[PDB]
């Protein structure tokens, strides 16, 4: 049961003994393997992610987790190399009981859709997590509901799995084949190598539509079929839209397909402010897509800024307004909307 190691942690340079037990496997995947454990000193639950190797690719997940401190991002407590094939790296992370994907599935299996209030809360904290990494120029590049940790009582969301994460710098190129296929932005389908962090915003728009539809909006069988799925809703891209996604890409004609009206994409009950926000996220043109802070300020979230807002269980909402100056870097003037009067000072 009990296991002991020495690791530095986030804050200092102070390797120290930490002991954990009751270890259980959570899952296997592209991220490696994640275990649950109890830290012996505090009794707190933790998640432990194990991954590697140099392979020919430039991983970055450490050096990104050490830089981040956000209530909507899972925190890195500790890390420690170990045996287990080759050496092994372990990241010790905050444990969170659920994922948005699992909770969205629980509603779908009951032929229920996730309540809008949870759609607003979950989507708002994701964009807030996105605004924070994007202020550092960092792009998550794998925004999918499986990577959205969630505490069901508090409705707190925590972005996780930064194993695809990269700090984008103009003029450096980046692989096009990145991001789970269903959430992959069209620029990536077109082979663009100069893409911005706007791809995460496209992915967040896929998550939003999925939370409204109860199933993924663009389930492609291939990268090429992913573009067909998008076209069936967005309709055929038109130059310059193709040009804005990939300036060097050229000949695409493709039968012209009329866009499906956005009101017909979603069930009739869907509130227009959710449909309208989605239209401003699922744009072909990356520059047309909203910034995360611009999404937070969207009217779809106005209910979260009301003074008389409570979770359906009656608990207070998680903190939504404790913005840092860094978090507001993209547009500090937006704070007047983002911070409602009752939350000021």
């Amino acid at each position: 049961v009990t296991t002991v190691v020495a690791t530095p942690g986030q804050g200092p340079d102070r390797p120290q003994e930490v002991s954990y037990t009751d270890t259980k496997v959570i899952g296997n995947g592209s991220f490696g393997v994640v275990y649950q454990a109890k830290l012996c000193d505090s009794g707190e639950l933790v998640a432990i992610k194990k991954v590697l190797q140099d392979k020919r690719f430039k991983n970055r997940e450490l050096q990104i987790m050490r830089k981040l401190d956000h209530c909507n991002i899972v925190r890195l407590r500790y890390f420690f190399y170990s045996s287990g094939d080759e050496v092994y790296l372990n990241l010790v992370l905050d444990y969170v009981p659920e994922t948005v994907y699992r909770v969205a599935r629980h509603y779908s299996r009951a032929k229920q859709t996730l309540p809008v209030i949870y759609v607003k809360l979950y989507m708002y904290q994701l964009f807030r997590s996105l605004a924070y990494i994007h202020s550092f120029g960092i792009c998550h590049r794998d925004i999918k509901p499986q990577n959205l940790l969630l505490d069901p009582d508090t409705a707190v969301l925590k972005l996780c799995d930064f194993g695809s994460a990269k700090q984008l710098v103009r003029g450096e190129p980046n692989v096009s084949y990145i991001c789970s296929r269903y959430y992959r932005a069209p620029e990536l389908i077109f082979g663009a190598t100069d893409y911005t962090s706007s791809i995460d915003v496209w992915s967040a728009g896929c998550v939003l539509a999925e939370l409204l539809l109860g199933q993924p909006i663009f389930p492609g069988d291939s990268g090429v079929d992913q573009l067909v799925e998008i076209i069936k809703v967005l309709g055929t891209p038109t130059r310059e839209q193709i040009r804005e996604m990939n300036p060097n890409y050229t000949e695409f004609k493709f039968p012209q397909i009329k866009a499906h009206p956005w009101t017909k994409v979603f069930r009739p009950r869907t509130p227009p402010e959710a449909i309208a926000l989605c239209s401003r996220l699922l744009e072909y043109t990356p520059t047309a897509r909203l910034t995360p802070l611009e999404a937070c300020a969207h009217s779809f979230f106005d209910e979260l800024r009301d003074p008389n807002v409570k979770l359906p269980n009656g608990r207070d909402t998680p903190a939504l307004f404790n913005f840092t100056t860094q978090e507001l870097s993209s547009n500090p003037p937006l704070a007047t909307i983002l911070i409602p009067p009752h939350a000021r000072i």
Binding site: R56, F57, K58, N59, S164, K166, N174, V175, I178
Partner: peptide
């Protein structure tokens, strides 16, 4: 991802 990117190689190298």
């Amino acid at each position: 991802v990117s190689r190298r």
